[PDB]
Amino acid sequence: GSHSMRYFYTSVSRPGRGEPRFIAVGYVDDTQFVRFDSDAASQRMEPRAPWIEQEGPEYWDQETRNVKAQSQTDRVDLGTLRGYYNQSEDGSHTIQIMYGCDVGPDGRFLRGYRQDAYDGKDYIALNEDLRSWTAADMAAQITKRKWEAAHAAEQQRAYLEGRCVEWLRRYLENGKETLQRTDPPKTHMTHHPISDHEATLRCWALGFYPAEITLTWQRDGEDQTQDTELVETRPAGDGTFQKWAAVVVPSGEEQRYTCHVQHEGLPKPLTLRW
């Protein structure tokens, strides 16, 4: 279905000596494909997926120079925001920036996004119209007026509707064998006695891609949320995801309980019973 390209930037000030720690990561849907880490020896944007490795030397040289320019902007902005909020030189502060585009299954632009945080709270965001900004406080209000004067929204909108979608389309083609492939969950159920009268039923989903999934329990064909535990979806580390849903039941009654699995990779929802 729909696809996304997102970039995440984190800049952390280092009050004792030196530039801030800067980390940039690029994702296509749930797959990381590039990274820049200021603490790494290379000082280059690096490939994190095999399908991006085929990009030429000038792609890497430009990506390296462009992401380094963002780290310098972040360095200057950490100093600027410290002034806006009247903070001391002794503290560590954080700026986070996220932006990206969504394309339809065919390849055309759906939506764009851009938002910035300071010290883990909203600072400034580009609105849904991609033409105006939302400033969370008076410090972000100063930035908004600088950006309105400088036509910052217009440059972000142009990237999001232009280069962003053009490059996401190229990436989707280059990595089609893996990016356009859905891996359905591999499911199983386990049983864990708590006492001689109660037991936990655990329903597992392993090796799925994309990360989006729904695990739900039913007792005699009705939705059960009481005595349930669902862990957050977690990376397997190989590109796939995992999740489990558990329910505490009276021993002898486990046949009343059914686990329901919904995932893009399943042509029809799946049911598991003990």
Partner: peptide, 10 residues
């Protein structure tokens, strides 16, 4: 690909 010039100064 990233923004060529990056975000605008805050």
């Amino acid at each position: 690909r990233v923004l060529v010039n990056g975000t605008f100064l805050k």
